[PDB]
């Protein structure tokens, strides 16, 4: 009856160091219909075995979910988060920028 | 501890 | 009448079931039905099946509706199956309303012209609360209902005339809200009417 | 102010079976319990060490409370469809938030007990813990039923007693983490934007009480304008991250300072590139 689009942040749990295994996070928050599709990508391809937090919500009733997977960052490989939601005219792909 | 079980809306 | 005539259906110890208690819905017939189906219609339709039991005089199945919850309240009909695999059902029994009670505060119940009355005198029972129940239900020891009288001195009340007093009885009263007619308040304090 | 908050979500899925029911509990910014109706053999599960030893009776009755609340929500969603004259074809969402604030003197400061339907306020227990606020005429039916049931008196005894007493117990058993603030690890990075300008990014990482303030200053003066700031985000291990950035003329970098305020720092931190 009221819908809200997700905010998205792609980032790592620990500061990136190529070679050192780490965790790639996709944080989706602020969205209202909890039905949401979130995929992590490596070089455009879907990573399987991605896990996520338990659904909870904020003061305005909007939902938040952390999606994450173990990865080892490198120089060549590109990582992204792809999100789909009823509120999005098309899936939103946010690239991992190791500086944000 | 959970807020128990409430009445239905 | 044929083997497709309707069976009977009753509640033990009765159809008004306190929250979280159990009731037994019994279907029975002199027809030796091999199976019975109990159907609850409406918002939470369900269907239960029991093999038939045959004692002297009656073929029965005892359906226990346990931990009384609001999704178990409603209208029940039941059926006998002349057959075993695909069911070949009889006519449905008369419907039976199973209500859950104890969900709201008890109403007050009073006798307008006094509760101990001479034979012949007319008597009105009145169900009143300050909760805004839509409907009131009066039961002599089970289902008679009247609509609530909207905000007068703030109480909601419904009056049941009992007519000229013949035998008397013990009366209780329950309130209810229009959208969930099978979900009732606590029983009022029971009122004994004496016809002397 | 310490707090305990529970969050319940039920989502109907027409045709795809019974509604999905999910509930989680927090002390402050620490999740400690979880229940998901889609898990295999669902039950309440611990998510913090300091409820793992509460024993099997504790965990069994929490599990039964969850399962009854999941089915109570199914009736509530069906009622709400009726109230709004909605078909059985749409998906719908009922959310319930309930909890406790203690404050320094540690008895109840504020109670919370409130609901949303399809993302909109539906009904809320008022700050007085005896009366309700209905958002529309459908929720006025719920209000009328809850006044007749004397529901506010059950919520209130939970908020003033149970909720406060168990929060105090969780704070004691988990004092080693719930009451020891974990300070941010901080550093400033420098990203050239051109030849005449660069981005200074001040970073706070791995801090636990999620509340934090990062202020960039120029010669001590708060740089309100021109400071990009991200939403505090979970690191995934129970700690949090946040950065604040500012665009500076290359050459003047060292008259910029980052002021970090956080419960795990005795004094606020001033740092520079």
- Helix/strand/coil (H/E/C) assignment for every residue in D30-65: EEEEEEECCCCCCCCEECCHHHCCCCHHHHHHHHHH
Looking at the complex, does the CB of residue D235 fall below 8 Å from at least one CB of chain A?
yes
Record: contact D205-A29, CB cut-off 8 A: no
Cβ-based neighbours of A3, under 8 Å, separated by 6 or more:
A32, A33, A86, A87, D119
Q: Residues D204, D205, D206, D211: what is their CA dihedral angle, to the nearest 10 degrees?
A: 30
Provide the residue count of chain C.
196
Chain D residues lying within 8 Å of B9, measured CB to CB: 76, 79-80, 94, 115, 122-123, 139, 142, 145
Cβ-based neighbours of C9, under 8 Å, separated by 6 or more:
C25, C26, C27, C38, C76, C77, C78, C93, C94, C96
**How does DSSP assign D164-218, residue by residue?**
HHHHHHHHHHTHHHHTSPPPPEEEEEEEE-SSSEEEEEEEEEEESSS--EEEEEE
Chain D residues lying within 8 Å of C131, measured CB to CB: 144, 147-148
Domain D185-271: give its CATH superfamily: Immunoglobulins (2.60.40.10)
Chain D residues lying within 8 Å of B6, measured CB to CB: 69, 72, 96, 151, 154-155
Mutate to test the interface with D, among A26, A54, A70 (most CBs of D within 10 A): A54
Q: What CATH number was assigned to the domain covering residues C108-195? A: 2.60.40.10
Q: Say if residue A78 is preceded by a cis peptide, omega within 30 of 0.
A: no
Q: Are D94 and D117 in contact (CB under 8 A)?
A: yes
Query: C186-189, long-range: CB within 8 Å, 24+ apart, which pairs?
Result: C186/C101, C186/C102, C186/C103, C186/C104, C186/C105, C186/C106, C187/C101, C187/C106, C188/C106, C188/C107, C188/C108, C188/C109, C188/C127, C189/C106, C189/C108, C189/C109
D81's tokens: 């469809």
Method of elucidation: X-ray
**For residue D211, which phi and psi values (nearest 5 degrees)?**
-60, 135
Chain B residues lying within 8 Å of D68, measured CB to CB: 5
Per-residue b or e along C146-182, where b marks 16 or more CB atoms closer than 10 Å to that residue's CB:
bebeeeeeebbbbebebeebeebeebbbbbbbeebbb
Chain C residues lying within 8 Å of D150, measured CB to CB: 105
Right CATH for D3-179 from 3.90.1150.10, 3.40.1010.10, 3.40.30.10, 3.30.500.10: 3.30.500.10
Looking at the complex, does the CB of residue D141 fall below 8 Å from at least one CB of chain C?
yes
- DSSP bridge pairs for D27: D4, D30
Record: contact C105-D150, CB cut-off 8 A: yes
Domain ranges in chain C are 8-101, 108-195
Sign (positive or negative) of CA dihedral D206, D22, A70, A89: negative
Same fold flag, C8-101 and C108-195: yes
- DSSP bridge pairs for C65: C23
Q: Tell me which residue in D65, D113, D146 faces B7 most closely, judged by beta carbons.
A: D146
The domain total for chain A is 1
Q: Select from C122, C131, C124 the least CA-distant residue to C174.
A: C131
Fold classification of C8-101 is Immunoglobulin-like (2.60.40)
Q: Please return the burial class of D149, using the count of CB atoms within 10 Å of its CB with bins 0-12, 13-18 and 19+.
A: buried
* Resolution in units of Å: 2.5
Mutate to test the interface with D, among A1, A22, A24, A63 (most CBs of D within 10 A): A1
Chain B residues lying within 8 Å of D158, measured CB to CB: 3-4
Q: Are chains D and C in touch, 3+ Cβ pairs below 8 Å?
A: yes
Chain A: nearest CA to D29, how far in angstroms? 12
Subunits with 3+ C-beta pairs closer than 8 A to B: D
Query: C70-73, long-range: CB within 8 Å, 24+ apart, which pairs?
Result: C70/B8, C70/C100, C70/C103, C70/C180, C70/C182, C70/C183, C70/D75, C71/C44, C71/D71, C71/D74, C71/D75, C72/C17, C72/C40, C72/C44, C72/C98, C72/C100, C73/C17, C73/C98, C73/C99, C73/C100, C73/C180, C73/C182, C73/C183
C173's tokens: 């009263």
Record: contact B3-D79, CB cut-off 8 A: no
Q: Are D95 and D9 in contact (CB under 8 A)?
A: yes
Chain B: nearest CA to D79, how far in angstroms? 7
Q: Which domain holds residue A47?
A: 1-100
Looking at the complex, does the CB of residue D185 fall below 8 Å from at least one CB of chain A?
no
Subunits with 3+ C-beta pairs closer than 8 A to A: D
Record: contact C105-D82, CB cut-off 8 A: no
Chain C: nearest CA to D87, how far in angstroms? 12
Domain ranges in chain D are 3-179, 185-271
């Amino acid at each position: 009856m009221i819908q809200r689009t997700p905010k998205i942040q792609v980032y790592s749990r620990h500061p990136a160091e190529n070679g050192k295994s780490n965790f790639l996070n996709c944080y989706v928050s602020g969205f209202h219909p909890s039905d949401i599709e979130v995929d992590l990508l490596k070089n455009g391809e879907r990573i399987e075995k991605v896990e996520h937090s338990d659904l909870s919500f904020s003061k305005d009733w909007s939902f938040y979910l952390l999606y994450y997977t173990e990865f080892t960052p490198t120089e060549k490989d590109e990582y992204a988060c792809r999100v789909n939601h009823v509120t999005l005219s098309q899936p939103k792909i946010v690239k991992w920028d190791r500086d944000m | 501890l959970n807020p128990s079980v409430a009445a239905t809306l | 009448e044929g083997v497709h005539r309707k069976p009977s259906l009753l509640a033990h110890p009765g159809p008004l079931v306190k929250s979280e208690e159990t009731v037994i819905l019994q279907c029975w017939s002199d027809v030796r039905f091999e199976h019975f189906l109990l159907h609850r219609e409406g918002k939470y339709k369900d269907t239960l099946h029991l093999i038939g039991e045959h004692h002297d005089g009656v073929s029965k199945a005892n359906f226990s509706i346990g931990p009384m919850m609001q999704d178990l309240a409603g209208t029940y009909r039941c059926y006998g199956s002349v057959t075993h695999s695909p069911y070949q059902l009889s006519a449905p029994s008369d419907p039976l309303d199973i209500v859950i009670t104890g969900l709201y505060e008890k109403p007050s119940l009073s006798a307008q012209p006094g509760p101990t009355v001479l034979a012949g005198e007319s008597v009105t029972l009145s169900c009143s609360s300050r909760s805004s129940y839509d409907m009131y239900h009066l039961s002599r020891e089970h289902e008679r209902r009247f609509s609530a009288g909207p905000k007068v001195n703030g109480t909601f009340q419904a009056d049941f005339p009992l007519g000229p007093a013949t035998h008397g009885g013990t009366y209780r009263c329950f309130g209810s809200f229009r959208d969930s007619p099978y979900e009732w308040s606590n029983s009022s304090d029971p009122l004994l009417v004496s016809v002397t | 102010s310490h707090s305990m908050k529970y969050f319940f979500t039920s989502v109907s899925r027409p045709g795809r079976g019974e509604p999905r029911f999910i509930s989680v509990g927090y002390v402050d910014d620490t999740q400690f319990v979880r229940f998901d109706s889609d898990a295999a053999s669902p039950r309440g599960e611990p998510r913090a060490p300091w409820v793992e030893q509460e024993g099997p009776e504790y965990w069994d009755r929490e599990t039964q409370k969850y399962k009854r609340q999941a089915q109570t929500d199914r009736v509530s969603l069906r009622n709400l469809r009726g109230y709004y004259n909605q078909s059985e074809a749409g998906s719908h969402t009922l959310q319930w938030m309930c909890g406790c604030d203690l404050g320094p003197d540690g008895r109840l400061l504020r109670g919370y007990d409130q609901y949303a339907y399809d993302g909109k306020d539906y009904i809320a227990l008022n700050e007085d813990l005896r009366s309700w606020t209905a958002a529309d005429t459908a929720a006025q039916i719920t209000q009328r039923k809850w006044e007749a049931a004397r529901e506010a008196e059950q919520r209130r005894a939970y908020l003033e007693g149970t909720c406060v007493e168990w929060l105090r117990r969780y704070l004691e058993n988990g004092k080693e983490t719930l009451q020891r603030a974990e300070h941010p690890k901080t550093h400033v990075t420098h990203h050239p934007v051109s030849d005449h300008e660069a981005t200074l990014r001040c970073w706070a990482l791995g801090f636990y009480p999620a509340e934090i303030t990062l202020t960039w200053q120029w010669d001590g003066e708060d740089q309100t304008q021109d400071t990009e700031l991200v939403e505090t985000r979970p690191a995934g291990d129970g700690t949090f991250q946040k950065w604040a950035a500012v665009m500076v003329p290359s050459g003047e970098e060292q008259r910029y300072t980052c002021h970090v305020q956080h419960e795990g720092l005795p004094e606020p931190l001033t740092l520079r590139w």
